[PDB]
Tab-separated table of C-alpha atoms in Angstrom:
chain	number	residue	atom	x	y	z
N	1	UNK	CA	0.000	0.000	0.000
N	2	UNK	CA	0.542	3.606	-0.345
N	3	UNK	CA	-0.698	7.084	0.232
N	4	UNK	CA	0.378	10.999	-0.576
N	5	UNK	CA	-0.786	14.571	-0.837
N	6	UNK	CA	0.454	16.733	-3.561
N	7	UNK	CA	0.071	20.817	-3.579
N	8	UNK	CA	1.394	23.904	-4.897
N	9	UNK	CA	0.433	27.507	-5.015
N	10	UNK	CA	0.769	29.604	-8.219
N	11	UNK	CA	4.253	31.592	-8.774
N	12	UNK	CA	5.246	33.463	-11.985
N	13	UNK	CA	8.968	34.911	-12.167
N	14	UNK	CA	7.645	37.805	-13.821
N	15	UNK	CA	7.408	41.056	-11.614
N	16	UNK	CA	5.081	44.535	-11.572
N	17	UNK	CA	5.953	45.973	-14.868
N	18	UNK	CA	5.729	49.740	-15.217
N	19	UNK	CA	5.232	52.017	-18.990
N	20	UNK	CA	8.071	53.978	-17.093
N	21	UNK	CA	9.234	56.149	-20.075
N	22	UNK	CA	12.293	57.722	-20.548
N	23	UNK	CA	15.973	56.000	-21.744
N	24	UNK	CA	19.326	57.022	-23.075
N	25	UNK	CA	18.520	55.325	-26.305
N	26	UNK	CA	16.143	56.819	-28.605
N	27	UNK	CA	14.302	54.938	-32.176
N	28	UNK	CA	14.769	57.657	-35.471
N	29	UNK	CA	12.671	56.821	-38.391
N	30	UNK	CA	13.938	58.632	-40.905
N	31	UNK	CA	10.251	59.769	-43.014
N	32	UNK	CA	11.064	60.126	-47.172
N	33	UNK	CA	14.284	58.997	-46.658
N	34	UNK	CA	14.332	59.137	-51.116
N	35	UNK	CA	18.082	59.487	-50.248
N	36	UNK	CA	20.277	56.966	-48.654
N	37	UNK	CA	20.308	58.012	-44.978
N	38	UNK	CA	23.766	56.581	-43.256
N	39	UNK	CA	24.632	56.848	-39.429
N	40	UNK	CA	26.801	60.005	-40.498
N	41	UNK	CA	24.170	61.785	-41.858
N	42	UNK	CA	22.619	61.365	-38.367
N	43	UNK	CA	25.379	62.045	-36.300
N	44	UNK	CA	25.997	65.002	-38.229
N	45	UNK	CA	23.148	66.551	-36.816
N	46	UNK	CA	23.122	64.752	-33.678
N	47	UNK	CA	26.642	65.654	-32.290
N	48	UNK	CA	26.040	69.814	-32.490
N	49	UNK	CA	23.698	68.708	-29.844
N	50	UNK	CA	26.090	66.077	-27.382
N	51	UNK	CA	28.150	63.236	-27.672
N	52	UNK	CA	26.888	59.794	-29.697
N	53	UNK	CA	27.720	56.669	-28.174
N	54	UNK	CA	26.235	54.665	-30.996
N	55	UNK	CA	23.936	54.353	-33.900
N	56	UNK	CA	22.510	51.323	-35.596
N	57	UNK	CA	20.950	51.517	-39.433
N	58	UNK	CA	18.514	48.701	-39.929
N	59	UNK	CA	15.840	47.543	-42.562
N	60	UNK	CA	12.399	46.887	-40.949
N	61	UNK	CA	9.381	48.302	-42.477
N	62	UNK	CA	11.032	51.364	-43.265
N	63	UNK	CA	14.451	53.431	-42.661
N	64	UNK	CA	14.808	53.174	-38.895
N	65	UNK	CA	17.556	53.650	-36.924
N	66	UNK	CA	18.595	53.424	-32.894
N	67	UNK	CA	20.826	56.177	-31.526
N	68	UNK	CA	22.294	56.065	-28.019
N	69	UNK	CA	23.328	58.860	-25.860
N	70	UNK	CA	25.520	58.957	-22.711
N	71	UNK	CA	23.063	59.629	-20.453
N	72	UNK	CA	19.270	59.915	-20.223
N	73	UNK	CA	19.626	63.877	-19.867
N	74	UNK	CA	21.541	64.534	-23.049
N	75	UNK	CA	18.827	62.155	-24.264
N	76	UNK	CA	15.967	64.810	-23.192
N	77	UNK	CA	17.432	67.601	-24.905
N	78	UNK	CA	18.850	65.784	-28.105
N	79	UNK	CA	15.825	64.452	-28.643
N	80	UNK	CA	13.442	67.726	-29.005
N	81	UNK	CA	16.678	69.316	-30.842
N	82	UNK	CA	16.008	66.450	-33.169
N	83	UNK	CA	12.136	66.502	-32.723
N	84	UNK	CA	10.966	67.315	-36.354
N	85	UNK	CA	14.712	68.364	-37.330
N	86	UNK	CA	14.335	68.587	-40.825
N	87	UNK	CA	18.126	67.791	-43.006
N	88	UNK	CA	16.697	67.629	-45.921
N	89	UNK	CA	14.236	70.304	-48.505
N	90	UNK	CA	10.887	68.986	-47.265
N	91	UNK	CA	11.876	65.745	-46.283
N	92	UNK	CA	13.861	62.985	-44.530
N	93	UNK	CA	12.034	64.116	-41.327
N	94	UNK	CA	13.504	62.814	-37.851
N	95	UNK	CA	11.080	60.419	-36.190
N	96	UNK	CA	12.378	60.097	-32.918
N	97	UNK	CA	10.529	57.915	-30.240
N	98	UNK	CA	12.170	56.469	-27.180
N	99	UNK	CA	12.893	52.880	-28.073
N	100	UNK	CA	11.738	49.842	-25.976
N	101	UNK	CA	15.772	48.558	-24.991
N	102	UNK	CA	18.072	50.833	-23.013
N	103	UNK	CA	21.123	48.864	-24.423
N	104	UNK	CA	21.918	48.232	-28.059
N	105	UNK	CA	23.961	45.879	-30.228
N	106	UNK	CA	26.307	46.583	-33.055
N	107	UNK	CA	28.104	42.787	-34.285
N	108	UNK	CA	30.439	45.162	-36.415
N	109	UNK	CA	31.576	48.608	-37.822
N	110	UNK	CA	30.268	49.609	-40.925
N	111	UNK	CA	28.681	52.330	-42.621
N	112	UNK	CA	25.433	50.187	-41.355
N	113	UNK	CA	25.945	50.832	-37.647
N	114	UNK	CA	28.929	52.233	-35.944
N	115	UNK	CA	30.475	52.616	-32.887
N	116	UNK	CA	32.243	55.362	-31.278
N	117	UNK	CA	32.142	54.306	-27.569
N	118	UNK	CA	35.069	51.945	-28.760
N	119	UNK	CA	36.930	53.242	-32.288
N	120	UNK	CA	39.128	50.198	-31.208
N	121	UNK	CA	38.081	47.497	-32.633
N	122	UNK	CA	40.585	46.181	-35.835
N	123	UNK	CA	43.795	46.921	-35.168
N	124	UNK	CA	44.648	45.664	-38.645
């Protein structure tokens, strides 16, 4: 013969999540980008406002991409700077919109995405 209880209570690991806005890193969508749009273009305009730690070009669903700043303050600032910034004659309008991620990722240096933080990276 034999004989046992089994119980358990619910537990998730998730915890209280918050739409706490505000981060260093900030997603530009370029609008009409008709002209190729690479990180220098942005960081043109982005540097007469404070240093660029990073910016990362991609492909989804339009032009878009991330740009990083030291700090969430220079992020304030640079951001209404760039807030409807136009570069270009009635276009290539600056979408910026505080991304979801605080932290980015760049796998290499290229006119793509690049990397200031660390200009050390081939020391070919």
């Amino acid at each position: 013969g034999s004989s046992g209880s089994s119980g358990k209570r619910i537990t998730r690991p998730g915890n209280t999540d918050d739409p706490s806005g505000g981060n260093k890193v900030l997603l530009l969508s370029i609008q009409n980008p008709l002209y190729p749009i690479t990180v220098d273009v942005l960081y043109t305009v982005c540097n007469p406002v404070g240093k660029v730690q990073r910016i990362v070009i991609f492909k989804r669903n339009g032009i878009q991409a991330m740009v990083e700043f030291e700090s969430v303050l220079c992020a304030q600032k640079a951001k209404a700077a760039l807030n409807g910034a136009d570069i270009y004659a009635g276009c290539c309008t600056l979408k910026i919109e505080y991304a979801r991620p605080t932290r980015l990722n760049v796998i290499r240096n290229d006119n793509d995405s690049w990397d200031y933080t660390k200009p050390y990276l081939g020391r070919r």
